[PDB]
Design a protein around this ligand. Structure first.
Ligand code: PGT
Ligand code: LMT
Ligand code: LMT
Ligand code: LMT
Ligand code: LMT
Ligand code: LMT
Ligand code: LMT
Ligand code: LMT
Ligand code: LMT
Ligand code: LMT
Lengths: 419, 419, 419, 417
């Protein structure tokens, strides 16, 4: 009964998800049948499972391929605790039972994020996309609590949670929208539109991830970081250079992956949510969060921010609505900071963006009352000319790049600050 | 460049039939056109012949490449002794001529299974599928005897006997059914259903052979064998452990191969017989043999068991039907053991399964008699509760595991008896 | 001037025609637009020229790439001496002008086949397929002489004489049939049938040239020749073995090339004449020549044998028809041997097959008169059964293999010279 | 490290250098052609292909020209939109000249810097000689009012056109937009495909066979012999003149046919550059066949406009003198565009004097033939000998002009440069 099982699942192929461009050959061929079936309004639901599982396994068979075993636990864990809650939802509905089931479903993510802090080493039950899978699972539990979701077969649950195109770190879905878009196969014209969009997305993702991302990450970023460390001090010009370069590199890499995921999802007939829609032209933090990682930000607005606001207003803990909104903004942004990983700089980034949103709300209210005062006094309202827009875009870009500098983790290297 | 032809044959590539998963890619592409051809009403004879011969040669070459020659002669032998009977079938059917033709058809198998016993090491005639090929050949000499087969060209004969997805050790087939199933190409929707079933079979075979068969074969079996040998004695708990582990490994490996073969056959538009249908849950041995190796068990039921019962009743050797049935069961299982190989443990396995079958028949008769006795006495019949079903399943499973342990040959190493 | 263009010609890319399976990928990709255009009843007549010229150049750019220059002379020769007849043909029909034009058109072939005998070195005009282009370039003139051929554009001439699929050494065409097949594009059903036949031919050509031809030529033939030379003497068993092996190798290589050429021609929409149709079941010399290199044998029957018979009968040189037929057979076979090449063994092969045809005609006449005599005398006609047919097949096969032994040129090494 | 050396690291694919480049281009352009078959445009795959091939053609040993290209693109966009915003209000007849000068400023700097101290400017790149002609086009078409609206996509798609980027045929805006927006039907598309295949084959023949023979086999030894003999003139001078002229034609026509074929595979038929020029009887009819795109461009936007400017100011008394001056100035400006050296300007002035002499001879011939018809004498016959004489003299003058333009006359002599 030797425990050489880890060695068994290590010589398997390691086809990287969106690695070399030739990958899109294999997947393309593997997606040739399913897409054809969509033209005839027929869904295989078996060959799709085969291709999804094969590509997930090829993606997860890395140097630390043992993570596959974690998956074979994680899935089971979710299947244990989602369905259990459903059984309870058949009989009764209590706040504490829902809280316990949600906490148990999100527990693997909590362990993966916390264990490197306490023990200092990666947790056993960690794999490539556990930061983007639990968001589906807990989401379904939430959809049970509100009563929107009542019944679903296991095939639907597993084909939703373990979606291949958006598995590693991709757009975050919900169960209602995904299921409704999976049941009703779109007609031929919309299918052809989606095919054209998918080809365009594949080409754009090639450009983003294989040209711009490589240039900004593996060519300028290392020498810029080394020069910044050599300069030393609290701040310097190389710090600004690395801030801007890393911000652009992060955006380009994430947008390239998102385009790849959207293209592959379209090739299966499903319209996954978009992530980035020109986020750097944003002229305000609130508008920025409607552009940067749209799936994640919208998910947190739907399930973490709005529900917290409702809870706070139900108990009327805070008198004015503005104070409740500010508190909920800070809590939501801090929690979003936690999701990346509980360190000093990720939590700093979360609180930073929370403070930014609070300042944005305060400035919106103050601008409204100042416009009212000026209009009442006969003066014209504040100018909306190109100069004001340029100033707003510049301020937003500077704040976003400062946030991406803190989030970059470069402040741990520049300043050896333990906490 | 060649030296001896055997070395040149060894030079040829060796592709294990259903070995690495990558193998399924090759056949997949090799089966891509033909399957599409099944959608329409045409079949590519030349392509099918070429792909079948190519994969047969690839499976036959390797360290024992000379076996290819043993195949070729064998083929001629069959063509020598099948068609001859056909000509004789045109004139008359004397029993002794039919017996002689059947014996000459199955003579290569007799020599292959005899030569290792009674001195010697191994016969030159032996090759990969010789154990599962004569069943097809003697599958026609019998049918000619019954008169249900009259005409067939060489193309049909060799296309059936040299079937590629069922060559190495696959679901034993019959001629009439195979010809009737290949003459009529199935419709489009049935073809899509067959494609889905083939994909499910491929996935399940992956699970059955490359995951669980590996675990039960190369992880637990060697340590359990070592512990059992170290313990010694007539028997011990490690013997029970190795019995259970080997039985599971054998079932999983055989089911994986059979599902692979059925999937590849379905991709060729032909529905080969199913070998395994949920064993280990059978209440009775007689109902176990309708689920374990279904193709071979049904073959022996049709062409060996029932025919022998007819022969015995024609000469009315025994007084009652029950004795004839018992003797037929014993002879059928003994012939199965002989087909497996003429050793001590294979014959022990055959005799033990025959004993199980006859005891099952006797117990069924006794239970029917006692139920009649209770019915005529007014007493409630013996309970058929879930506990009785569990008891029957447990007894059948234990007997099957013991039979597999005997068939393993591990008992021979353990005891060294009858060496 | 420098004269270094030959060196330039040696740095062009090289692609052996039907050399590798990957060559068919390029060929199919290039010919797909032509097939699609055929499906819609359209011929580009320019893209075809481009693909044909590119593949001819890639085939002719071997180690002796200078042969390309010879082609750039040969065409400029043939055109000059084809149209020179066409202008004259409209005016008058003097026999000597036709003889002179035919001789001048066949002159490059005469030089290529003669110069290696006189000077001992390859002639300048020689290139890959002159012996299979002079036939078309003299068939055009012969058709002009009969008056069957009339006004035709240069495009038709150059697309007929320089046909890409049958350029190197392929099926020999005529102009009228090829032109009529080129003008009338076949319907969609015939196009599908031709595509299926072409795929079958490609697979069979793979089997013949890349498997059987290699085995019979590069593996057994050199050892057999070496052992035959070591044995020495006028005749020996290794010589018989190498005779049979080389006969099979020659047939398989030529049939593989012919099937490749037929497939590629079918992909262009025209069906070139077949070359081999089971030559080794001939049962007679006449039925052998109606099966062995059918395009060449039929060409020589149409334009060399029949015309010679007509010439001899017009002047009634010989008293009876049989003498004229025998003389024409001998002359035709000697001229075929000449066309192969002016060596002792090629002329021996030609005159040998001529003697064979003569004695076959004598045997047919004697069998006819003997059957008549036996029928008149009441005796049964001589049997025509399995054994008689087998004896005829054996005699024909032995004579053909002796002919291919003489034609092999092995006699020059064994009998004459020293080794 | 990302530097100029990093730009030099990128692969270099010389435009229309080897047939494998054509295989690459055909494989890349096939989807665009099939899409145009069904009357749709991608506007993204086209941009990616164009940018990729431009970069590959630009990433040579001196690959620092991509920065020059980016600076040129920014400069052209800035000044074109500056004029467009200004044209909406009013035209002052001098702001147009200022904008035209600021648009041609990169070109004039690139053509002046080599001949001022020692070297070309840093902003020079591959196709700057054939790109400015498009930019000024826009400005010209804004002055006449025939162009009013265009987005950035159309403008950059027209200026950064891939098939005619390096030295391909010079286009105009209005025609290019009219041809791009209206995709041709299926049958005309097939005809264009056949013409493109014919162009590819003929370009193969022109550039990869004949140009190689006339450039690498005869030109070096002929130049060597001409230099060895020396003197003002010699028979090897005539040999090198003829060989260089044939090499120039068989190379430029091959490249132009390649560009036209690649453009046709993208559904746009760029203007034909060469239509058998050597058979032209007269000098004036020669310029309608040799470098047709460039000659027509200079006829439309440089010659006729200058004639109009001179006539509206009535500087000269009669039309003939104005036409002569316009011809001389047009040919001199073409010579300047080629490069500011002694032999390019000599070539321009020589072609100008050829044009004016041709005009004068045509007028004199018309007058003398009118007098002959009045006097009863039959007009001079032209069936086979007069036409041959005209063709021969035009060909001789063209060959001499090409010899002067060759720059070999500079090596042969040591005249003041
Ligand atoms: C009704 C009132 C009239 C008032 C007077 C009108 C006068 C008009 C003057 C227009 C000046 C335009 C200035 C921009 C073009 C300069 C052309 C030039 O110099 O040649 C170029 C060659 O041509 C081109 O590449 C583009 C030519 C087209 C220019 C079109 C601009 C607008 C013209 C409109 C009116 C045309 C009048 C005649 C223009 C020559 C580029 O130079 P190069 O590299 O050959 O070097 C020569 C350099 O100047 C010497 O150092
Ligand atoms: C449904 C049909 C389609 C399903 C998928 C079909 C395509 C499957 C491709 C499997 C092979 C991928 O081929 C790829 O080759 C590369 C480069 O050699 C290797 O790549 C990998 O090698 C080994 C693991 O094998 C690792 O140590 C290494 O880090 C990694 O790069 C692997 O062998 C495989 O990842
Ligand atoms: C330490 C905390 C982090 C630093 C925080 C910095 C971010 C603060 C907010 C960003 C600046 C917002 O400042 C200013 O906001 C106004 C008011 O909406 C924006 O103005 C805009 O508002 C909205 C768009 O959302 C429109 O309806 C309005 O017409 C337009 O003028 C300006 O574009 C921006 O210049
Ligand atoms: C490695 C082992 C190699 C040995 C295997 C060799 C391949 C098997 C050869 C089979 C015989 C080929 O010769 C065969 O002759 C028979 C004569 O009826 C015909 O056979 C035909 O029979 C059926 C009857 O419906 C046709 O539908 C079919 O198209 C074809 O198979 C063909 O002409 C040819 O297929
Ligand atoms: C080699 C040594 C022996 C090997 C084992 C022998 C075979 C296995 C034990 C005998 C079979 C056990 O299973 C036996 O058949 C079935 C299945 O539960 C039960 O009985 C079943 O069949 C009888 C037939 O009369 C029905 O009336 C009854 O309703 C049904 O439950 C028996 O009560 C049980 O005793
Ligand atoms: C629409 C038209 C389509 C045209 C089809 C494509 C034509 C061009 C094909 C690719 C170019 C030729 O590709 C060819 O590849 C072979 C690989 O064996 C190489 O050529 C080789 O030829 C022989 C045989 O293989 C070798 O012995 C030799 O050493 C080498 O020159 C060159 O790389 C090139 O000659
Ligand atoms: C319209 C035409 C339809 C048929 C089109 C497709 C048929 C041709 C397929 C070509 C497949 C690839 O072509 C060839 O395949 C062989 C098969 O082992 C492999 O390579 C083979 O040839 C190469 C070179 O000759 C050898 O070095 C090698 O040992 C051998 O295996 C490669 O994969 C590729 O060189
Ligand atoms: C240097 C000489 C080279 C030539 C060598 C020999 C060339 C071969 C030709 C010899 C004849 C063989 O062809 C001959 O055909 C005749 C008539 O069809 C048949 O002749 C045979 O069959 C007939 C019945 O048909 C019977 O009378 C008898 O059994 C026999 O004559 C045989 O098929 C074969 O004997
Ligand atoms: C080698 C260096 C290359 C430098 C960069 C070259 C790329 C430059 C991109 C120019 C286009 C940017 O311009 C922006 O693009 C979008 C999206 O394409 C255009 O959007 C649209 O424009 C045209 C206008 O008819 C449409 O036909 C087209 O479908 C679409 O592209 C907008 O008009 C413009 O807002
Ligand atoms: C470097 C200095 C300049 C070099 C020379 C440049 C001019 C070269 C051409 C000079 C001759 C003009 O060429 C002349 O063209 C005219 C019309 O164009 C042709 O035709 C004209 O003359 C013929 C003479 O028979 C008459 O029919 C009629 O007057 C007219 O048609 C002449 O056949 C040709 O001789």
């Amino acid at each position: 009964f030797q425990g050489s099982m880890i060695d068994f699942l290590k010589q398997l192929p390691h086809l990287e998800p969106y690695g070399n461009p030739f990958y899109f050959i294999y997947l393309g061929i593997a997606l040739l049948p399913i897409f054809i079936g969509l033209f005839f309004k027929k869904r295989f639901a078996i060959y799709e499972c085969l291709v999804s599982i094969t590509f997930i396994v090829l993606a997860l068979t890395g140097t630390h391929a043992s993570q596959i075993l974690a998956l074979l636990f994680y899935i089971v864990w979710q299947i244990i605790w989602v369905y259990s809650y459903k059984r309870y939802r058949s009989q009764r509905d209590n706040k504490w039972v829902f809280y316990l089931h949600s906490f148990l479903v999100v527990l693997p993510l909590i362990l993966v994020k916390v264990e490197p802090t306490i023990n200092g080493t990666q947790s056993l039950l960690n794999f490539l996309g556990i930061s983007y899978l639990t968001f589906r699972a807990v989401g379904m539990i939430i959809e049970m609590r509100d009563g929107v979701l009542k019944e679903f077969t296991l095939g639907e649950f597993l084909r939703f949670m373990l979606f291949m195109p958006t598995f590693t770190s991709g757009p975050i879905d919900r169960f209602k929208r995904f299921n409704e878009d999976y049941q009703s196969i779109p007609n031929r014209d919309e299918l052809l539109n989606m095919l054209e969009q998918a080809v365009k997305y594949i080409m754009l993702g090639f450009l983003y991830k294989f040209v711009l991302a490589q240039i900004f990450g593996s060519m300028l970023l290392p020498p810029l970081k080394a020069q910044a460390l050599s300069q030393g001090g609290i701040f310097n010009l190389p710090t600004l250079g690395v801030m801007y370069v890393y911000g652009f590199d992060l955006f380009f890499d994430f947008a390239g992956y998102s385009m790849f995921a959207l293209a592959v999802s379209n090739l299966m007939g499903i319209k996954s949510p978009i992530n980035f829609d020109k986020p750097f032209i944003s002229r305000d933090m609130k508008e920025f969060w409607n552009r940067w990682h749209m799936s994640l930000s919208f998910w947190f607005r739907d399930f973490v921010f709005m529900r917290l606001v409702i809870v706070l207003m139900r108990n009327k803990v805070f008198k004015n609505r503005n104070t409740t909104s500010n508190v909920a903004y800070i809590i939501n942004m801090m929690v979003m900071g936690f999701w990346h990983g509980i360190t000093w700089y990720y939590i700093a980034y979360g609180i930073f963006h929370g403070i930014g949103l609070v300042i944005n709300d305060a400035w919106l209210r103050k601008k409204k009352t100042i416009n009212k005062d000026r209009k009442k006094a006969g003066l014209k309202p504040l100018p909306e000319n190109k100069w004001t827009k340029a100033l707003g875009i510049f301020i937003t870009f500077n704040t976003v790049m400062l946030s991406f500098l803190i989030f970059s983790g470069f402040l741990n290297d520049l300043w050896f600050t333990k906490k």
